[PDB]
Ligand binder design. Structure first.
Ligand SMILES: [Mn+2]
Length: 227
C-alpha cells in the first residue's frame, strides 16, 4: 500500500479516495476551461509530447522559466489552490512520515519528510501519446530546495510509466507505474531526482472514474511544490 522507492521517496498506492478523484477531475475540468486554464507550453525541460498544463497558486512560465503572479502570454492570474487539495497533500506527507517511522528500525537514521505548504500546483494533462522528458524540479528557491521540501504528485486517469534517477540518462533510470489514485512524494535526498513520463498506458483508467467524472482519454497529474 505504501512503497519505499529510495530515501525520501514514497509511493502511496490508491491514496486518493473515490469521491476525491471525481472532485479533483471536476474542479480541474472547470478551472481548465476558464481564465488561466490549460494551454500547450512551447517549452518544457526535457521535451514533451501531447501535453497541456495550467498552474494553480503561483504560475510557472515556460518562456521565462521562472515563477510569477500571472501568465505572461495572456496576463491571466492562476486560480488559487483549492484548500481540499492542500489538505490531501498534508495527509499524504503525514501518512508517508508514519510509514517511514515504522520502517526505521535501527541500523540507520530515522527518515522524515519535511512539511509542505504548497503554493505551486502544476496541472499536467497528457493525452494517450503523452510524454515528458527527464528533468529536475530545480526552479524553486534555494532555501526550499536546500531544505528538501518535497514534491507531492497526484495521478488520475490512465497509468503513467514514470522514470526516475540521479542523472539525465534513461539507461540509468528506474521505472514505476503511477496508476489512478496514486500519490508520489519525493523530498529530502530525493528532492532533485531526474524524472519524467515515458509513456501513458492507454485504456487503464478505472471505468467508474471515466464514467462518473466524464474523463477524456489520457492522464491528469497535479504536482505540488513550495516555492
Ligand atoms: Mn517534474
Amino acid at each position: 500500500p505504501l512503497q519505499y522507492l529510495r530515501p525520501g521517496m514514497v509511493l502511496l498506492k490508491k491514496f486518493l479516495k473515490h469521491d476525491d478523484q471525481v472532485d479533483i477531475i471536476r474542479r480541474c475540468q472547470k478551472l481548465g476551461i476558464g481564465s488561466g486554464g490549460f494551454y500547450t507550453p512551447g517549452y518544457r525541460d526535457g521535451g514533451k509530447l501531447s501535453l497541456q498544463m495550467m498552474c494553480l497558486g503561483k504560475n510557472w512560465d515556460p518562456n521565462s522559466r521562472s515563477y510569477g503572479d500571472t501568465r505572461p502570454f495572456d496576463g491571466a492570474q492562476p486560480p488559487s489552490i483549492p484548500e481540499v487539495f492542500s489538505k490531501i497533500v498534508k495527509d499524504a506527507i503525514q501518512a508517508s512520515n508514519e510509514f517511514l517511522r515504522q520502517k526505521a528500525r535501527p541500523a540507520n537514521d530515522v527518515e522524515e519528510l519535511p512539511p509542505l505548504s504548497p503554493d505551486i500546483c502544476l496541472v499536467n494533462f497528457y493525452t494517450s501519446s503523452g510524454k515528458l522528458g527527464l528533468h529536475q524540479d530545480k526552479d524553486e528557491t534555494k532555501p526550499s530546495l536546500h531544505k528538501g521540501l518535497p514534491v507531492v504528485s497526484f495521478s488520475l486517469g490512465d497509468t503513467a510509466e514514470f522514470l526516475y534517477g540521479d542523472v539525465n540518462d534513461v539507461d540509468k533510470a528506474s521505472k514505476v507505474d503511477l496508476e489512478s489514485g496514486d500519490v508520489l512524494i519525493f523530498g529530502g535526498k530525493s528532492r532533485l531526482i531526474f524524472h519524467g513520463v515515458s509513456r501513458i498506458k492507454p485504456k487503464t483508467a478505472p471505468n467508474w472514474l471515466t464514467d462518473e467524472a466524464k474523463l477524456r482519454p489520457g492522464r491528469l497529474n497535479l504536482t505540488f511544490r513550495q516555492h
